[PDB]
Write a protein that binds this ligand. Structure first.
Ligand code: VY2
Lengths: 300, 237
């Protein structure tokens, strides 16, 4: 188990760690989060009490370095930093652990939720979507736009998700206009999977990352990407069976985790109704259809 | 975006544009089978592609062989229409290519947009005008060429005959739409109006009779009376 130490908490803030969250008061003796499960990516996120504008946070993996949070009073935010001196880092974490100045990551033993949401998410792929090569962790926030959003404005601060556009020359072979528009299989299997992602694991990783950025930061472009990647599979007549079964599992856990009170802003009625009830795969997502119909029947 | 009554003079500006109407592409007769089921038999159809400024009509005849062995024909018909319009655009010299294609039915938007992806600067637009172009097959010479076709064929017409020698394209389009609306509302009565007088004939190279300016006023008034008469009959007014 690894640890993320806080120099201090000078401003009142709601802190998220993966799917959990807690409040820290202004100048409360808080010095970080311990017992973070090794083996998964994680996200530590922030929403300031005095300014709910800009949710922001950092994706990280404690296997890639020793990371700590320090508040910057000039830029007005909690910043993730890497500590190169490992003995220094261990000494500071030990002091704060001994003084019980840290919250414990509260994973229940039965609970595979975080694994289920991040199964295909790897830090190396996050760092290609979020470009800041000098850090081993990746900053995301509420307002960051995607490359596709910037085509339809700072390119350095963008989310480089894979552009999906059903009415584009990439998606439609000349001479196969009706075929390719009504059946997205070419675009899914040849262009996206064989061509860009190389395999379904990378495709699902990006889909999972987009969902998590949508949910944790309210990032609109990420929500668009998640829905597009779902709709691309559902609108394809020819999808490997293992992919459909895995997609059903991925979506089931995403819908299970989504806060009920955010369903109006996180779920696109058109896309979900199309995917569950009209698409080629309308009968292939049994677990997702069942949870959607029982949790969010209004949307449908 | 969409095209309506506010931007109606836009139809007659100097930006090349085409209307596309797909209502006569896929045409069937419905009949009982020997076992008492129902079957369709396709008949030849056509794509109506019209330049409203010049009157040039690119009538692509859709021969029934194009449906042989195909499924979901009403869907296919939209994509076939888009394919043929795209092929027409590609066949035209660059300076004759339209800047806008206006589809009479919104279901044509996606098929045409997809077929025209190679032409990002050609706007594909719907219209809020209810245009009576389905009645094209009430024009005897157009119906004749469509029904006699034994293979796919493109035939070029000027749907305004020589009217632009005497009137503007705004007025010509207004006359055309009045005539087609009348033919759509009561075809027999409209044809009686147009042909009742034997001394006025249709030139071999024309679609409509050779009315003088004053006779066209009379004809136009009779067509408006027909439309209003049929409205009263329909709604008991
Ligand atoms: C300005 C230089 O500052 C640091 O290097 C630093 O703060 N390191 C650190 C390491 C572990 C925990 C904490 C709380 C701080």
């Amino acid at each position: 188990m690894n640890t993320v130490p806080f120099t201090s908490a000078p401003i009142e803030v709601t802190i998220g760690i993966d799917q959990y969250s807690f409040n820290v008061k202004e100048n409360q003796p808080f010095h970080g989060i311990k017992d973070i499960p090794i083996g998964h990516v994680h996200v530590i996120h922030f929403q300031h009490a005095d300014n709910s504008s800009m949710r922001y946070g950092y994706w990280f993996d404690c296997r890639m370095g020793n990371f700590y949070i320090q508040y910057d009073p000039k830029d007005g935010l909690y910043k993730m930093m890497e500590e190169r001196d490992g003995a220094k880092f261990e000494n500071i974490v030990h002091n704060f652990k001994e003084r019980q100045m840290m919250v414990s990551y509260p994973k229940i033993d039965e609970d595979d939720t975080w694994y289920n949401l991040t199964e295909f998410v790897q830090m190396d792929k996050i760092r290609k979507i979020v470009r800041k090569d000098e850090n081993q962790f990746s900053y995301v926030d509420s307002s960051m736009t995607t490359v596709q959003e910037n085509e339809l404005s700072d390119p350095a601060h963008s989310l480089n998700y894979t552009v999906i556009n059903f009415k584009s020359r990439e998606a439609i072979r000349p001479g196969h206009e009706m075929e390719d528009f009504l059946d997205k299989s070419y675009y899914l299997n040849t262009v996206m999977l064989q061509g860009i992602f190389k395999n379904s694991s990378n495709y699902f990783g990006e889909l999972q990352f987009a969902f998590l950025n949508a949910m944790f930061f309210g990032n609109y472009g990420s929500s668009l990407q998640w829905h597009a990647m779902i709709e691309l599979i559902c609108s394809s007549a020819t999808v490997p069976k293992h992919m459909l079964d895995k997609l059903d599992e991925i979506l089931y856990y995403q819908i299970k985790t989504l806060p009920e009170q955010y369903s109006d802003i996180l779920l696109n009625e058109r896309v979900w109704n199309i995917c569950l009830y009209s698409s080629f795969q309308k009968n292939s997502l049994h677990n997702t259809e069942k949870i959607m119909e029982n949790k969010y029947p209004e949307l449908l | 975006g969409a095209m309506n009554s506010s931007n109606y003079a836009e139809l007659f500006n100097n930006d090349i544009k085409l209307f596309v109407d797909d209502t006569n592409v896929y045409r069937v007769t419905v009949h009982k089978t020997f076992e008492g089921n129902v079957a369709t038999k396709a008949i030849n159809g056509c794509i109506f592609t019209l330049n409203p400024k010049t009157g040039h009509l690119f009538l692509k005849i859709i021969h029934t062989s194009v449906w042989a062995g195909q499924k979901r024909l009403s869907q296919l018909a939209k994509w076939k229409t888009a394919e043929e319009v795209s092929a027409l655009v590609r066949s035209l010299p660059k300076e004759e290519q339209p800047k806008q294609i206006i589809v009479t039915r919104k279901a044509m938007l996606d098929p045409l947009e997809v077929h025209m992806l190679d032409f990002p600067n050609i706007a594909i637009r719907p219209t809020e005008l209810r245009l009576p172009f389905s009645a094209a097959m009430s024009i005897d010479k157009l119906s004749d060429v469509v029904m006699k076709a034994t293979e796919p064929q493109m035939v070029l017409f000027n749907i305004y005959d020589d009217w632009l020698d005497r009137i503007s394209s705004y007025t010509a389009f207004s006359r055309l739409t009045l005539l087609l609306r009348a033919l759509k509302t009561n075809e027999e009565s409209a044809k009686m109006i147009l042909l009742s007088d034997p001394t006025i004939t249709i030139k071999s190279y024309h679609l409509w009779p050779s009315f003088t300016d004053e006779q066209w006023i009379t004809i136009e008034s009779q067509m408006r009376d027909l439309i209003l008469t049929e409205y009263g009959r329909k709604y008991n007014v």
